[PDB]
Structure 1
Amino acid sequence: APLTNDPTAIGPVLPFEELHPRRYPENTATFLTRLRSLPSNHLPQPTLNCLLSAVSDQTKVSEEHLWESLQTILPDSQLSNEETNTLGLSTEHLTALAHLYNFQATVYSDRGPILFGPSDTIKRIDITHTTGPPSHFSPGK
């Protein structure tokens, strides 16, 4: 994996919920990651930015500040890679954003609602997901 040799990461590979313990929905934060080593490298915004746009619409937080906050918590190898440039951001980034900004997100997918983000929070947002193809995130329900 690229994050095993990521210069901007330090420490062993651990699940996200172990590195940043919150009241996550079960197995939604078990994805492998590493602790950020260097500060933000100020990566350019992903071209496929509809996940950030949907979160920005709901939380009234600018997409630049959302993306900068991700660069403080995740290594660069999990922020700009082959999936990010071709498909866009994932609900794993939503979980990281949810931890950063203390909200729980409800994602109304084509097959039913799902939850991402710590439950020990007050702010609640709604995201709509379509399989497509290609998949798209939109605010609201």
Structure 2
Amino acid sequence: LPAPLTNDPTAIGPVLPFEELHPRRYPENTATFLTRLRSLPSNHLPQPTLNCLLSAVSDQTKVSEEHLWESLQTILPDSQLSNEETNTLGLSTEHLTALAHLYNFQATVYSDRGPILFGPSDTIKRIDITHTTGPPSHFSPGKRLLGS
């Protein structure tokens, strides 16, 4: 079990897969990442410097980055929102899954190696987000396909 997560003051209860705490119809091997129930209210963390996942989702949902970020703070413990990883490498498809649950959409992520689904299927809203390793590793709104 992730030690920072098990000592996170904003969290309560056992460490469990996201989908166990927030059951939806998630694609296989997504929503399996470990987390805990959010207990304490928002600390109003600064938006991440590396925030283009939020910008990409914002473009697609018409929800401001600030609102997306405050929403994440209602469901994930702070240790999962502000840490060494987020500050150096940015947000991840785990955050995307959390947003997809909160805002009831399913995202198709058009990665360098093809489209990947993240978010609950028991939804109507659909969004498109592109990811590339680049460099730099970058999310953006819309579709992208590669091949020969």
Taking structure 1 as the reference length, what is the TM-score of the superposition? Answer: 0.99
- Residue deviations 1:55-75, cap 9 Å, x none? 000000001110000000000
| Displacement of 1:138 | 0.3
Which runs of 5 or more residues in structure 1 are unaligned? Answer: none
Alignment size in residue pairs: 141
Distance 2:87 2:25 in 1: 30
Alignment partners' CA distance in 2, 1:119 and 1:94: 14
- How far has the Cα of 1:134 moved from its partner? 2.7
Distance 1:56 1:75 in 2: 22
Question: What residue is the counterpart of 1:37 in the other structure?
Answer: 39
Q: CA RMSD in A?
A: 0.6
Q: Distance in 2 between matches of 1:104 and 1:80?
A: 24
Q: Alignment partner of 1:72: what SS?
A: coil
TM-score between the two structures when normalised by the length of structure 2: 0.94
In 1, Cα distance between the equivalents of 2:134 and 2:64? 26
Q: Deviations over 1:64-122 (max 9, x none)?
A: 11000000000000000000000110000000000000000000000000000000101
CA–CA distance in structure 2, aligned partners of residues 125 and 56 of structure 1: 10
Deviation at 1:10, TM superposition (A): 0.5
Q: For residue 37 of structure 1, report the CA deviation from its aligned partner.
A: 1.2
2: CA distance between counterparts of 1:56 and 1:10?
29
Deviating beyond 2 angstroms after TM superposition, the runs of 4 or more aligned structure 1 residues are none
In the TM superposition, residue 25 of structure 1 has moved relative to its aligned partner by: 0.5
- Measured in 2, the distance between the counterparts of 1:40 and 1:64 equals 13
For 1:20, which of 22, 29, 39 is the aligned residue? 22
Percent identity between matched residues is 100
Q: Report the alpha carbon displacement of residue 40 of structure 1 after superposing the two structures with TM.
A: 0.8
d(CA) in 2 for partners of 1:58, 1:90: 17
Secondary structure of 1:13's aligned partner: strand
How many angstroms does 1:132 deviate by?
A: 1.9
